[PDB]
């Protein structure tokens, strides 16, 4: 109702930064981002893995199939996979050996729901190594794969321009 | 906030990046850094530069080895 | 008092942190173990960095009739 929320710097105390303006916390945005790993950890990291792998997947094509090193390809193995089914791979363990900055070793299974979560102190960590696996495992099958309905999609194209 | 670099100690649990650089450039300063004795040191420069002569022959070898099958002689 | 409109529906209000969408499409365990071997992750990565990276580079460099540098 007010001048802009009940007017506030942060959630509350103004001695943390964030300076909650728009571009920060307008219900216009903060909802365009929480089926995913923004505020709350849906299901485990398991599945988010491939919508992440895949979406980021069929990117990196015209970047390296239309800006490729000697470009506009007449090779049936480009306008798609070619190599870049390398990036996802050079970085699908650019990750795994960051989940070695995560260990914390468990197995609860709580992607099913119980009592309206919080995951509470959900900030900081509180996602152990046996989580960051099933994500960067979702990554490979999201990266490699997400590279082919790029490729596989013929190409009808416009522009332009 | 863990414990790492296996010789120094002040360096070892320094939370920044100095942690790194300063690791990779105290290595060769044996005389006085944690691990050392006038007995250690000496020998710890001795089987060091026996790690020398050693690397001078993997140089010279290849010098004579990109030459013998191509590289006119 | 007409513009005192009793806040034309309060809302409740604050929706929530509560509850402005259900969740994630039911597509899941339609990958259960499907693609496992990062879902058998129980000791790996050393395997996929000789394997995958000896076949992004073994045949990837070699070639039977140049099309040269």
């Amino acid at each position: 109702k007010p001048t802009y929320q009940v007017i506030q710097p942060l959630n509350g105390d103004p001695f943390i930064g964030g300076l909650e303006t728009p571009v920060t916390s307008s219900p216009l945005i903060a909802w365009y981002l929480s089926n995913l790993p923004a505020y709350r950890t849906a299901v485990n990291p398991l599945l988010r893995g491939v919508e992440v792998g895949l979406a980021h997947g069929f990117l990196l094509v015209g970047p390296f199939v239309k800006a490729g090193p000697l470009r506009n390809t007449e090779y049936a193995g480009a306008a798609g996979s070619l190599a870049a089914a390398g990036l996802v791979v050079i970085l699908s363990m650019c990750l795994t050996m960051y989940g070695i900055a995560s260990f914390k070793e468990g197995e609860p299974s709580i992607a099913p729901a119980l009592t309206l979560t919080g995951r509470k102190k959900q900030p900081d960590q509180l996602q152990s190594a046996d989580g960051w696996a099933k994500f960067t495992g979702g990554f490979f099958f999201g990266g490699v794969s997400g590279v082919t309905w790029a490729c596989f999609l013929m190409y009808v194209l416009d522009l332009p321009y | 906030a863990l414990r790492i670099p296996r010789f120094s100690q002040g360096i070892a649990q320094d939370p920044t990046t100095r942690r790194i650089w300063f690791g990779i450039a105290t290595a060769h300063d044996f005389e006085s850094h944690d691990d050392i004795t006038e007995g250690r040191l000496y020998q710890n420069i001795f089987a060091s530069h026996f790690g020398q002569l050693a690397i001078i022959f993997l140089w010279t070898s290849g010098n004579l080895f990109h030459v013998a099958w191509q590289g006119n002689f | 008092d007409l513009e005192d409109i009793a806040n034309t529906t309060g809302q409740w209000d604050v929706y929530g942190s509560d509850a402005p969408s259900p969740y994630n499409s039911l597509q899941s365990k339609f990958f259960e173990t499907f693609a496992a071997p990062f879902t058998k992750r129980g000791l790996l990565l050393k395997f996929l960095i000789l394997g995958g990276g000896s076949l992004l580079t073994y045949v990837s460099a070699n070639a039977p009739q140049d099309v040269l540098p």
Partner: peptide, 30 residues
């Protein structure tokens, strides 16, 4: 077969690096 001695620049200038940039991220942790 004809004309094929190209593996000792990636296994070195490429893959050997992969190893140690990975591996030696032992400096961070192991």
């Amino acid at each position: 077969m004809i004309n094929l001695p190209s593996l000792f620049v990636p296994l070195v200038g490429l893959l050997f690096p992969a190893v140690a940039m990975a591996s030696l991220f032992l400096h961070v942790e192991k």
